[PDB]
Amino acid sequence: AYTTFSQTKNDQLKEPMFFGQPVNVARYDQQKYDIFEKLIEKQLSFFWRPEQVDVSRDRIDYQALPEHEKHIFISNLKYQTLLDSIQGRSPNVALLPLISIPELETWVETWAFSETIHSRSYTHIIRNIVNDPSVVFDDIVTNEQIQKRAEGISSYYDELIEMTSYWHLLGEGTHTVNGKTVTVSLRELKKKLYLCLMSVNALEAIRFYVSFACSFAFAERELMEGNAKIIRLIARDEALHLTGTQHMLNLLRSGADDPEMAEIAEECKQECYDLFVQAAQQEKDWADYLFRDGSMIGLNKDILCQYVEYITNIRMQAVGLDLPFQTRSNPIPWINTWLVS
Amino acid sequence: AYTTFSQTKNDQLKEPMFFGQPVNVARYDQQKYDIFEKLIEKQLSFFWRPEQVDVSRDRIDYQALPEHEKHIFISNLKYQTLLDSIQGRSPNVALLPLISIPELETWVETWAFSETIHSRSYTHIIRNIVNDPSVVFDDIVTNEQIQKRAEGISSYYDELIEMTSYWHLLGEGTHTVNGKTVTVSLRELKKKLYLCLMSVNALEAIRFYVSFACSFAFAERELMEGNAKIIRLIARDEALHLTGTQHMLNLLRSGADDPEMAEIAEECKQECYDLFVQAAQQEKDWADYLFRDGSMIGLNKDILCQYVEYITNIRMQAVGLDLPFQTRSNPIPWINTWLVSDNVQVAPQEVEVSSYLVGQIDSEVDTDDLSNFQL
Amino acid sequence: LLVTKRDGSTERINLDKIHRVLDWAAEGLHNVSISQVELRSHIQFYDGIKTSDIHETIIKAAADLISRDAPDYQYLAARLAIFHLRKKAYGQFEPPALYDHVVKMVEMGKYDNHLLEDYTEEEFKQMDTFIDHDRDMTFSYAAVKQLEGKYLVQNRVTGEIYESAQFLYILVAACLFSNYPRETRLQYVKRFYDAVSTFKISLPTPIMSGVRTPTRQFSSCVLIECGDSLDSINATSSAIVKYVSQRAGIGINAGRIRALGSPIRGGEAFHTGCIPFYKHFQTAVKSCSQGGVRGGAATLFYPMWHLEVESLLVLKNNRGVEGNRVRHMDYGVQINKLMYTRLLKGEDITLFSPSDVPGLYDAFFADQEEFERLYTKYEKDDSIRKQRVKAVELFSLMMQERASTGRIYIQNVDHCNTHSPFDPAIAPVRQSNLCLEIALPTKPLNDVNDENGEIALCTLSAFNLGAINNLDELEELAILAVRALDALLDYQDYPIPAAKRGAMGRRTLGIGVINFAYYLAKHGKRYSDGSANNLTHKTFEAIQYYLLKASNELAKEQGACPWFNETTYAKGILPIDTYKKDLDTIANEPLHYDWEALRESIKTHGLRNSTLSALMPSETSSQISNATNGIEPPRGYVSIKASKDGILRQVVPDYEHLHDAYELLWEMPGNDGYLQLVGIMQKFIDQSISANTNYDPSRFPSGKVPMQQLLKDLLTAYKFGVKTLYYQNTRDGAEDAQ
Amino acid sequence: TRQFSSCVLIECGDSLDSINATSSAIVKYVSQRAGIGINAGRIRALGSPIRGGEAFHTGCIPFYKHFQTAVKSCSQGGVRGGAATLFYPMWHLEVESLLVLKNNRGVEG
Ligand SMILES: Cc1cn([C@H]2C[C@H](O)[C@@H](COP(=O)(O)OP(=O)(O)OP(=O)(O)O)O2)c(=O)[nH]c1=O
């Protein structure tokens, strides 16, 4: 089942990363994972707030912008706002009952806090440049494109939450409740966990990076410098989160923690690869609809599509999967010199 | 059921505190309640890492103070470390599914992160004054009194997450599982939620303030000064958590969401009185467990018992309940020096000042109004 | 409950003698309850408890009862603690004969033997006739606690108390006036002891705890500069060590080292930033001092046009890996009018490596037109390695860190140069001490103990504006104070030849004032409305003129200072001659005293001490006087002072008669009236002044603090002639009554 | 270049003068891309009075970290980072504390 204070005393350096005895004490001296200790260290180092950046010239430039530029900018902001709302709420409920090491537990907690700060940053950017953030957020919730993306994201998340509640409530085997047949199993639970983690990896590595590329290509023209600074800080925090998740996936799949998990990853490689490719195609279609009134100020669709290709192929080859594209040179070099210095 | 993003649009200004719809995108402009957003801002501006108060003199002071005082200090720190692990882990998984407003859910997440920093701080000021953090942290989990307090607190969280999993999987009403009938009643779920909230209020109200009383009574007598300053920062954040939970459950009980919730408030109010009595008894027993080898200067069984009685009186009166003891005065009147941080003129270049406010400035320069300024 | 002597010999309980002690302590007071003290103290009495704990717990239980309605418990607890001090020291209450005590202490090796070598038994007897032991009752609780925990001659690794405050004062006076003709030195000692034990003059911790003993380093504040070379950095580290070992707070001008990326040794290596060297100085200052009478503190300065300033402005921060943070050394940013105008015009400020631009660094301090010309020329040159940062960005970052960590001090150089007693061309001012309080000229070293370098040592003292009743006692106290401080200047022991050279060649001093809040609130005024400009002008004219006149008398009597030809008091220029003209519109009091006659007198003869006045924070030394810590207003009618010697309650003086006339720090609508008061003070005072700022978000809409208000207060403090800005005390509504 | 630098063996007496000289020597050699070995075992231990009870002594750890921050300064543009080894005797009063100065089980302070 699940509890918040286990009564035993287990060798916390021996328990697997997932699906073990739930933690009872938060301990910092005996670190089983230097990765998930340096991650919380660097994240506590990177703390910030919105109420440090200037946005007045941002507001004036937005007033003095073209209508299609207002459209693309505010729509990209809507996209990332939805993304980080999902990311601010999900990890706690979705993973904290499943974790068996205090290092990873505190890492996930600071991850959730960082996404909370991101969401507050986005609402602060909004309510300083326009007058109706109410309608901005309502068009967020109602807009069918970002809705389509939310479908897949929150579907992975709540599938995982459902299966974990089943496994923490009933046990294992084949069971009957209210006259149905439900067959919980640790193997399928681990499969769903791996798929959800691949989803979080693809999200933190692709969607936000397309959004940051758009905002920075905007700021290159010497407009929206406050947004430039804020999105730089957020790209820093998100690169940190991405490294954390990639190391999590490698420590799971490499067979160092669970050979069961190794075999399950070797089984679900196909689902992971196809999820990555479908996410990338969703990004490029979102870009196609973005460039409805033509193109932005000094760019086209080809450059941004090749950028999405580059980022998704690099993140895929890094996390340990095949390459789904024919790679070429960096199309938008300056972007990689604007996010992490 | 639960989902991390519900597509059904709703005016988040009309949804109840708990049990409403799974929350949509989080926004901080049209806010229903102001107290929780104010607390979010305050705890975003109260940020403090534990490595800012050089305690190098306090290692010496500790390894010089006697054995029973060593015991007192390290026991209080072990107990607080365990309970802040528990209470930095529980709020998330317990109260997060039952939230209908974004300000409240992000206040919950910020509270969990604050408790994470608190546990890191306790571990840090244990890892400094001794050379056997291994044995200290293992006695944490193994020890009997620590274990019994932690169980007394965590039982309610366990029951509440159990019932919430029931209510999110099966549904409302009576249902049969594995050849056995269960009665998932949303009314009993609300009652268990209010009970959990009141237990957490008791915990962050009386217990931790007894512990702070001990660790500050140390530093009244020229010892463990940097540790006292760190626990001063922690007592600040803990008072803020206390006021948060207080306002939350008081708003739930007053009748701002449902008269059935008010009736549940009456019944569970009797129950919570009988719960606070047990909490105070546990703290008294912990006091006479600590102070057996002999008293220190200005702190013993009688004084700490008086403090437990008085703090329970005050927390009850402030949480809208009865008074079980006599409304006597404060036995340790020198704790206001450590809690009230308004008239404390600390002398820097010796001891760090805990009065900064991280990043709480506007930073919108009116460069033209500045240009109208001849030097 | 059996009592236990200090060696194990138990004895039956005896609480009635302790009750008699309490009835003596609480005799002649009001609104107290020895019954309540007994009830609060008779709980922590286990069997066989000692007396060294009975007394401690009864003092604590009778001291935690100070509040805004029974303010005589401070005197109660002070009398109890001084009884305990007499007991622990001399066994009984009756103090011993001064001669017997001093000879026993020189036998122990506690005092200095030159006392017995100079004075005789008859002189010690007639000095014993001077001492007023029953003056001890006049102490406050914080006074006695600070005195015992930090001042009295004591053993550290054991914790034994030897002497009393009366012996402390009489022996400070004796060792101060032992090098004088025997005809009048006894009268000087009697007068100085009366004036220092009546709390008419305060003297800091270094001299107050050092002039009895074989340890001889009485210079409160030390100033060191650091050249651009490893040998100079080693000399700086060695100086820091040798001085913080002897109760001295350091000010390091490290803003001369080249910046990151600058080539080394003719272009074979490459520099690696100044963070390692800052860490090295921090470990030097923090290492060999923690055991002493106090901790080691060192401020570190740099000019804001430094290349790495974008990475050095933060070092005092709270969010960063140790590898790029140094958060136990206060910082100081040096800024001036060219930077200010680059801010106001909203233009870019450039940053150069302060060792790759010739003459620009010393132009920055010496002559502002030279600074302007060189700045523009080097900006135009297109072969240097330079960076470019927007000015609003940089100033907002600086004020952001200043507010976030409280301790990024601000120094306006051009005021320290163009309004000083030193000339800018032959002896400029490039830094200040730890508390941004003084300003003296220095020079970089090459070895630890050479002669081509200078290290500015400055001793301090202050007046008590809460004891004087007119403006002539100030002149008498001035002559006594200058006598004493010059005596110490020649009597010290300098562990470094460079500092000996500097201090003996300039004879610099500092004499400020405390209890200013009680003074200004006994004269029925306030800090906010702006009704004290006239009073400040008057009082500080009196102070500066009396100091200069006493120093001129001393110079006439015993020659001038051996470097007067490098001051700005030889050419005949005075503070009233060179103050900042913008102080005209905010003050209309005329000059009282015969300043032109004093000017011609010092022109003909010269001054003894090249720098007379300087205003000090006076955190610790102002507690024995039960005073207010300088030019700052209190924070509550019962203020809590927090030092490593116990947290202490302190009732603001004459609270029962002035409980409606003060203006606590958290009631002023802002800091503009206080900045104007500080501007006037700075006009009338030779060297820098340590001025704070206050900011309470609860007096602003949306709980914020506007960076516009921060920058406006900074630019006002610059416009009205204030050299430096010390603190950024930030409120936070952490309320929990209980 | 008349500079062929390698190991350097240095001894550190028990005095502020000798410690200043030791730190100066180690920084002056590390600037030459060398590696240091110090006999810092003479520095008296915590609790022993200074100047006959006049002051309290803090221990060996401040001076050890002082030599560390001196040795770690500016050997990054060369061939060898700041490398040093200290020595001390087992019967030193603070050997139970100086034996645990390399593990991560403790705070930087
Ligand atoms: C004086 C002093 C010494 N020390 C330590 C550092 C040195 O390792 C050690 C020796 O210093 P020494 O230079 O030998 O001082 P000392 O000779 O005056 O001391 P003593 O009279 O006892 O012989 O003392 C401090 O840490 N701080 C101080 O202020």
Ligand SMILES: Cc1cn([C@H]2C[C@H](O)[C@@H](COP(=O)(O)OP(=O)(O)OP(=O)(O)O)O2)c(=O)[nH]c1=O
């Ligand atoms: C030798 C050396 C110096 N430095 C830095 C530290 C000093 O603050 C600064 C000055 O070194 P210097 O001792 O002045 O070197 P130098 O005089 O031989 O070189 P130059 O003639 O060009 O002035 O260089 C390093 O960072 N690494 C090194 O290896």
Ligand SMILES: Nc1nc2c(ncn2[C@@H]2O[C@H](COP(=O)(O)OP(=O)(O)O)[C@@H](O)[C@H]2O)c(=O)[nH]1
């Ligand atoms: N090392 C060190 N120096 C100090 C400390 N307090 C003050 N100083 C120095 O002493 C000077 C005057 O300080 P002041 O507040 O007057 O100290 P006080 O007179 O003893 O109360 C300042 O310029 C500081 O440089 C301290 O705690 N440690």
Ligand SMILES: [Mg+2]
């Ligand atoms: Mg050089």
Ligand SMILES: [Mg+2]
């Ligand atoms: Mg010696």
